[PDB]
Design a binder for this molecule. Structure first.
Ligand SMILES: [Zn+2]
Lengths: 50, 65, 49
């Protein structure tokens, strides 16, 4: 698989943190999901993870 | 359910230190040094605070409210 | 009445949600208010949950 293709695929679902790649927050927490411990909306979880 | 006020063996007031132990946990203090700083020399109070499970919030999550 | 939109922490979501022993109020009887000065009859630790 091409490195440019892998890069284009990962840049849309991950971010660069100290040279490493971390998945985006919205990918882990969809819009219809919620916190399994407190029940807060997914937007707040995404903001906190960001 | 909730942290008891008195210790079973001796009887030292320990319910007032539950929130302090939780704060020490949120901090970088470990269980051992946290219990040491809380002033618990004898192991009875250390066990009372360490083996305690916090279920009051789990029950309030089901409370009528 | 005034809290954040999320307010995931109960400390900010609710008020007086932890009934500490400091809420106890000593009600004098007869001449006990005159016998004991204010502040003497109170919980010892004042922080027992
Ligand atoms: Zn004890």
């Amino acid at each position: 698989i091409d490195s440019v293709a892998v890069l284009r695929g990962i840049q849309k679902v991950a971010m660069l943190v100290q040279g490493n790649w971390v998945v985006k927050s919205d990918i882990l927490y969809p819009k219809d999901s919620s916190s399994p411990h407190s029940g807060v909306p997914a937007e707040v979880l995404c903001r906190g993870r960001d | 359910m909730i942290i008891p006020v008195r210790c079973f063996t001796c009887g030292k007031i320990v319910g007032n230190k539950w929130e302090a132990y939780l704060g020490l946990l949120q901090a970088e203090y470990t269980e051992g040094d946290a219990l040491d700083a809380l002033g618990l020399k004898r192991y009875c109070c250390r066990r009372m605070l360490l083996a305690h499970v916090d279920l009051i919030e789990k029950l309030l999550n089901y409370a009528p409210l | 009445p005034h809290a954040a939109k999320d307010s995931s922490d109960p400390n900010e979501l609710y008020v007086n949600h932890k009934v500490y022993t400091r809420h106890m109020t000593w009600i004098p009887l007869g001449n006990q208010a005159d016998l004991f000065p204010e502040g003497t009859i109170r919980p010892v630790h004042d922080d027992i949950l």
